[PDB]
mmCIF file of C-alpha atoms in Angstrom:
data_model
loop_
_atom_site.group_PDB
_atom_site.id
_atom_site.type_symbol
_atom_site.label_atom_id
_atom_site.label_comp_id
_atom_site.label_asym_id
_atom_site.label_seq_id
_atom_site.Cartn_x
_atom_site.Cartn_y
_atom_site.Cartn_z
ATOM 1 C CA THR A 20 28.829 -27.235 19.107
ATOM 2 C CA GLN A 21 29.753 -27.639 15.467
ATOM 3 C CA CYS A 22 26.817 -27.255 13.151
ATOM 4 C CA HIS A 23 25.735 -29.429 10.227
ATOM 5 C CA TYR A 24 28.024 -28.593 7.250
ATOM 6 C CA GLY A 25 30.364 -26.894 9.645
ATOM 7 C CA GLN A 26 34.016 -27.736 9.892
ATOM 8 C CA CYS A 27 34.607 -29.993 12.894
ATOM 9 C CA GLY A 28 38.175 -29.670 11.908
ATOM 10 C CA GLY A 29 41.038 -31.667 10.749
ATOM 11 C CA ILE A 30 44.706 -31.436 11.630
ATOM 12 C CA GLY A 31 45.307 -28.132 13.406
ATOM 13 C CA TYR A 32 41.755 -27.118 14.136
ATOM 14 C CA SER A 33 41.289 -25.387 17.479
ATOM 15 C CA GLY A 34 37.601 -24.518 17.198
ATOM 16 C CA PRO A 35 34.431 -26.616 17.760
ATOM 17 C CA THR A 36 35.473 -30.194 17.167
ATOM 18 C CA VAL A 37 32.298 -31.758 18.563
ATOM 19 C CA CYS A 38 29.493 -32.026 16.073
ATOM 20 C CA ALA A 39 25.805 -31.515 16.730
ATOM 21 C CA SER A 40 23.933 -34.505 18.067
ATOM 22 C CA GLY A 41 23.083 -36.574 15.048
ATOM 23 C CA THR A 42 25.889 -35.269 12.885
ATOM 24 C CA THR A 43 29.180 -36.997 12.440
ATOM 25 C CA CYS A 44 32.609 -35.463 11.991
ATOM 26 C CA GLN A 45 33.675 -36.742 8.643
ATOM 27 C CA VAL A 46 37.131 -36.120 7.305
ATOM 28 C CA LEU A 47 36.785 -34.910 3.758
ATOM 29 C CA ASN A 48 40.327 -33.631 3.599
ATOM 30 C CA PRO A 49 43.241 -33.994 6.115
ATOM 31 C CA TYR A 50 42.561 -30.548 7.435
ATOM 32 C CA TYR A 51 38.922 -30.207 6.488
ATOM 33 C CA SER A 52 36.499 -32.309 8.393
ATOM 34 C CA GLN A 53 32.807 -31.560 8.243
ATOM 35 C CA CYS A 54 29.883 -32.487 10.436
ATOM 36 C CA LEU A 55 27.417 -34.457 8.392
#
């Protein structure tokens, strides 16, 4: 599960795309999305 302040991933991310329960995957950049 993607951790708080972890990259849930933007375009081309093949890792943990699901954020921790209570955190939301927020796109900060097209490729950088973070779980806040």
